[PDB]
Amino acid sequence: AAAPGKNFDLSHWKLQLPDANTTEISSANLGLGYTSQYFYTDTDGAMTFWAPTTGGTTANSSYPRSELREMLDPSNSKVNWGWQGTHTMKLSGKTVQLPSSGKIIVAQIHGIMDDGTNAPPLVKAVFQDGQLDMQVKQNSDGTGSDVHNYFTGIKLGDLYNMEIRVTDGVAYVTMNGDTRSVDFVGKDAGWKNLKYYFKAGNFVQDNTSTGGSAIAKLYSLSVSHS
Ligand SMILES: O=C(O)[C@@H]1O[C@@H](O[C@H]2[C@H](O)[C@H](O)[C@H](O)O[C@H]2C(=O)O)[C@@H](O)[C@@H](O)[C@@H]1O
User: How many angstroms separate the alpha carbon of residue 64 from the centre of ligand 1?
Assistant: First the structure.
């Protein structure tokens, strides 16, 4: 019954919560065994993220989350990685319960300005009962639309194996050994002006009062920069 920080390497993740005040838990406190209604180890050992649709939201989102936010430097969220080189997150997990909207985001690459100011998400792994859509943003200024990458057949409760990789300004998005790519720096050179961090957890795409809540699980989670 050990807390997730004992089962996963959370030394370079902080946790963002869907409580009224959108509390954050540090890497160190995750390692010490932080657990709550929003974040816990289930009977199957999974790191489990729960968030209600009525939860608190961050300053630039309509939606609540129980979600890890990568910290290259666990003591400074303004230290983030760039477009050049290779940057890889791998995970395995499942979504157990959806809100009324039937949509959550279970993994991301998020952009950020050099000064820590918000920038657009780059990759969003959107889960629905029957499909994961690994969406890649076109433009670094947040305008335009997203490039969709549909992986159909993935159901509620099914185990997915996922990888999101950036190598030299190209995003490679993988679900169960099936990989698609989007050259994001090639769509917009402006992406070279931004930095990036991974996210993984449960970002609930429903903020309605009667929308219920969602549960997402992870069985493995690793990040590498090379
Ligand atoms: O809505 C936003 O601005 C959020 O930005 C990111 O989280 C940042 C936010 O300021 C949050 O309250 C806390 O201070 O962490 C910040 C960070 O880690 O950069 C982003 O991860 C997401 O929560 C949302 O887009």
Answer: 11
SS3 110: strand
H or E segment at 6? Answer: helix 4-7
Options 3.40.605.10, 2.60.120.200, 1.10.10.60, 3.40.50.740; which CATH number does 1-226 get? 2.60.120.200
Q: How was this structure determined?
A: X-ray
Give the containing element (helix H, strand E) for 185.
helix 184-187
Resolution in Å, one decimal, please. Answer: 1.7
What is the Cα–Cα distance from 125 to 106, expressed in whole angstroms? 6
Domain ranges of the chain: 1-226
Nearest-CA residue for ligand 1 atom 22 is: 58
Pocket lining: 69 vs ligand 1, CB cutoff 6 Å: yes
Tell me the CA–centroid distance for residue 8 and ligand 1, in Å.
Answer: 22
